[PDB]
């Protein structure tokens, strides 16, 4: 088998530089090149460059020249990309890839994706609120947090039927999110339902109980 | 550089029809082309390399053909598990990833389910008041949502969020939120949430009163 | 099922006018699966097959994986009887007698 | 794709330094049907029997497959001097059995 593992999401100031990593597993990088790919929400995919670990000869596109340096290290089967001179236009998702296509065989492996954000705001913690009213609908509301990543679950992950989670929306450098769950009339308030919110950046965990 | 043009930009099927997509090139690209698939919130996955072969695990439905300056990709019998975005890539030079084509399904119409939630006690103690309106499980996409306070129009501070087409029954959803200050909120008495859709000659209105 | 080997497959020949000898026409067939490392009873693989198997194991995905097929054949003789006429024919390459995947 | 025929498949050897570098070993690929539309020799009696069985309505557990039927040797040299000769490496013909 083969597996590509990457780093986590990063937020940087407008003018600093970042260093993303991509480490293989169950494979030897010396066999073939490694490609770095970019994705923007609505502009489609693009190509940045590729590296050949055996020799060290790298190739970059005609647009990203001079602001992206790729390097490799075979002692631990890892590749690094340094991105410099950010201008608030690089907020995107980056991928690590291996491609080979031939008339008789082919190999295609992709990473998981690393999210890069560029902004001048400040980190903040969320606020969690419950909502109470032959069916009943309940809701959990998350308000006033930064940056985007956050996780919401119902009853610690034992209730995944008829649950909707709407995407986040940003206004005045602050996000928002809501979740809704529908349950029959013979399971409330005869039981307990709680919404759990976890923000990793600030390392916060909150559980809230819905009551009439 | 080679430029790839993909058509059509939008598509819609009935879960039993045949589908064809075309991807033309700006210069002789021999027979180096690949067809991909990307589901929401996931990395792409190869489907067809070279011009005719099939990657391991691809079922028989998908097929592709072409040569020289014209390439086509066809699916015989669409199913409910084929909602994704399709790209065409070339490899004769610096890689290019087409533009992307969407896909959608059909079903019988349905009416929305409307719920309204008032502000909680903790939020009121904090200093703000947020009213929430959920619309669930409707079809087709378009809807209009309006807020009224004490029998009057109000269009300031509203936030709206839409969901993507479900993979279980192909139905949409929507959430609306209205924010106010505590002093302003306590001065009025009645609030209403109105929805206008294609499957009803009159609006669907859900209202609540503060005093009780 | 087991690994690649030989197995029985026979048919019956019928004619509206003449009578054929022998009746039951026997033509075996090769069937099974050959993997890596070899656990079989036939001769050792060739270099081409081991190359393909290594390519498959590294992570690649071939468009024509190895297949279990026969590699030898034997002839047969048939006799036909009918009033005022007996005939005989000999036809080569009819009965498979060995298997090995390529 | 077309009918059963021969097609290219090559690899690179890397360990000393070896000559030649590009190791070439073609492969057989395609589909053979009934009646024959190919450029290789005629089928045998076994294959036509199997195809007729398949056409009558039966369903075999091992339909005919396009495979090679000939091979050629090769010689390698390693410098750091050694030489080796290995037979049956390069396929040179195709025909389904």
């Amino acid at each position: 088998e083969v597996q590509l593992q990457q780093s986590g999401a990063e937020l940087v100031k407008p003018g600093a530089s970042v260093k993303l990593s991509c480490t293989a597993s169950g494979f030897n990088i010396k066999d073939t090149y490694m490609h770095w790919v970019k994705q923007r929400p609505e502009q489609g995919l693009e190509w940045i460059g590729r590296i050949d670990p055996a020799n060290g000869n790298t190739i970059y596109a005609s647009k990203f020249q001079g602001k992206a340096t790729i390097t490799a290290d075979t002692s631990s089967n890892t590749a690094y990309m340094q991105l410099s001179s950010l201008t608030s236009g690089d907020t995107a998702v980056y991928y690590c890839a291996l491609f080979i296509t031939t008339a008789t065989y082919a190999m295609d492996y992709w990473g998981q994706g690393t999210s890069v954000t560029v902004s001048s705001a400040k980190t903040t913690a969320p606020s969690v609120y419950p909502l109470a009213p032959s069916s009943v609908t309940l809701g959990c509301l998350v308000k006033g947090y930064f940056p985007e990543p956050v996780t919401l679950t119902w009853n610690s992950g034992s209730l995944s039927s008829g649950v909707h989670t709407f995407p986040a929306v940003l206004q005045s450098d602050l996000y928002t999110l809501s979740s809704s769950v529908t349950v029959t009339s013979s399971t409330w308030p005869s039981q307990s339902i709680t919404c759990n919110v976890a923000h990793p950046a600030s390392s916060t965990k909150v559980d809230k109980k819905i009551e009439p | 550089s080679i430029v790839m043009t993909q058509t059509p930009k939008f598509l819609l099927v009935s879960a039993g029809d045949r589908v064809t997509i075309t991807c033309k090139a700006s210069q002789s690209v021999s027979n180096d082309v690949a067809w991909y698939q990307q589901k929401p919130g996931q990395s792409p996955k190869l489907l067809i390399y070279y011009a005719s072969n099939r990657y391991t695990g691809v079922p028989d439905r998908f097929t592709g053909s072409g040569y020289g300056t014209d390439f086509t990709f066809t699916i015989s019998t669409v199913q409910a598990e084929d909602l994704a975005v399709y790209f065409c890539q070339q490899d004769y030079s610096s890689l290019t990833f087409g533009a992307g084509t969407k896909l959608e399904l059909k079903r019988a119409d349905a009416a929305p389910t409307v719920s309204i939630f008032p502000p909680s006690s903790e939020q009121l103690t904090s200093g703000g008041a947020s009213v929430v309106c959920f619309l669930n499980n409707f079809y087709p996409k378009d809807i209009n949502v309006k807020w009224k306070i004490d029998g009057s129009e109000r269009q300031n501070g509203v936030l709206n969020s839409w969901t993507d087409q479900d993979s279980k029954d192909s139905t949409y959803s929507m959430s609306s939120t209205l924010t106010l200050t505590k002093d302003e909120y306590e001065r009025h008495n009645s609030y209403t949430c109105e929805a206008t859709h294609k499957t009803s000659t009159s609006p669907i209105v859900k209202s609540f009163n503060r005093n009780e | 099922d087991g690994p690649c080997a030989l197995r029985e497959l026979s048919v019956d020949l019928r004619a509206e006018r003449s009578v054929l000898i022998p009746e039951t026409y026997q033509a075996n067939n090769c069937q099974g699966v050959c993997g890596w490392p070899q656990s079989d009873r036939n001769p050792r693989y060739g270099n081409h097959v081991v190359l393909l198997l290594k390519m498959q194991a590294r992570g690649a995905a071939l468009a024509r994986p190895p297949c279990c097929v026969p590699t030898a054949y034997a002839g047969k003789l048939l006799i036909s009887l009918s009033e005022e006429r007996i005939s005989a024919h000999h036809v080569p390459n009819m009965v498979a007698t060995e298997c090995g995947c390529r | 794709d077309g009918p059963c025929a021969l097609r290219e498949l090559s690899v690179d050897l890397r360990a000393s330094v070896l000559i030649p570098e590009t190791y070439q070993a073609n492969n057989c690929q395609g589909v053979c049907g009934w009646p024959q539309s190919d450029r290789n020799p005629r089928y045998g009696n076994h294959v036509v029997l199997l195809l007729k069985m398949q056409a009558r309505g039966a369903a075999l557990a091992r339909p005919p497959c396009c495979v090679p039927t000939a091979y050629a040797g090769k010689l390698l040299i390693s410098l750091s001097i050694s030489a080796h000769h290995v037979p049956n490496m390069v396929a040179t013909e195709c025909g389904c059995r």
Binding site: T32, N55, I59, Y105 | - | - | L76, L79
Partner: peptide, 24 residues
């Protein structure tokens, strides 16, 4: 040996041509 290694310059193509397998 040195001459052979020097003469085998790397390619400039932007896509991998084929796989590499050690002579084991």
């Amino acid at each position: 040996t040195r001459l052979v290694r020097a003469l085998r310059v790397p390619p400039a193509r932007a896509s991998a041509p084929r796989l590499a397998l050690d002579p084991d």
